[PDB]
Design a protein around this nucleic acid. Structure first.
Ligand SMILES: [K+]
Ligand SMILES: [K+]
Ligand SMILES: [K+]
Ligand SMILES: [Mg+2]
Ligand SMILES: [Mg+2]
Ligand SMILES: [Mg+2]
Ligand SMILES: [Mg+2]
Ligand SMILES: [Mg+2]
Ligand SMILES: [Mg+2]
Ligand SMILES: [Mg+2]
Ligand SMILES: [Mg+2]
Ligand SMILES: [Mg+2]
Ligand SMILES: [Mg+2]
Ligand SMILES: [Mg+2]
Ligand SMILES: [Mg+2]
Ligand SMILES: [Mg+2]
Ligand SMILES: [Mg+2]
Ligand SMILES: [Mg+2]
Length: 57
RNA sequence: CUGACUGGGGCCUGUAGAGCACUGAUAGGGCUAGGGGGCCCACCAGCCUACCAAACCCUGUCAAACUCCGAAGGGUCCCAG
């Protein structure tokens, strides 16, 4: 499982990166979600790597 | 539950780059159809050129409307989140 925390604001970033955060359920700064490590989920995690911090739990 | 976005799979494309196979452009040399003069000689032709220049050969380049090539990506469909 992956633990993903939103640490940088998506203001000013392209709409596809905003949509990737919505697909992951990250809506607030510093919000923390535990998601399953599957390629479909992981693909969106990589897309917004510069905005989030990822840990394995 | 079909959405943005994402994962896998197939198909579509001629840009970036690159290249000279086509079309044009183009540097140096070699070889020479044909040019300027020329030893001339019109009875008849070769030859002389550190003056041009067709093709050809070597070396060396350029291109939005060149392409023997050709990505990253993008588009679309199917299945999955
Ligand atoms: K669904
Ligand atoms: K050419
Ligand atoms: K595809
Ligand atoms: Mg920011
Ligand atoms: Mg905004
Ligand atoms: Mg920004
Ligand atoms: Mg900003
Ligand atoms: Mg916030
Ligand atoms: Mg180019
Ligand atoms: Mg090429
Ligand atoms: Mg040119
Ligand atoms: Mg030449
Ligand atoms: Mg070129
Ligand atoms: Mg160019
Ligand atoms: Mg070129
Ligand atoms: Mg053309
Ligand atoms: Mg081209
Ligand atoms: Mg579905």
């Amino acid at each position: 499982r992956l633990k993903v925390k939103l640490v940088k604001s998506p203001i000013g970033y392209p709409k596809d990166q905003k949509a990737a955060l919505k697909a992951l359920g990250l809506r607030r700064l510093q919000q923390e979600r535990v998601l399953e490590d599957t390629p479909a989920i992981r693909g969106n995690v990589e897309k917004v790597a510069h905005l989030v911090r990822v840990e394995v739990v």
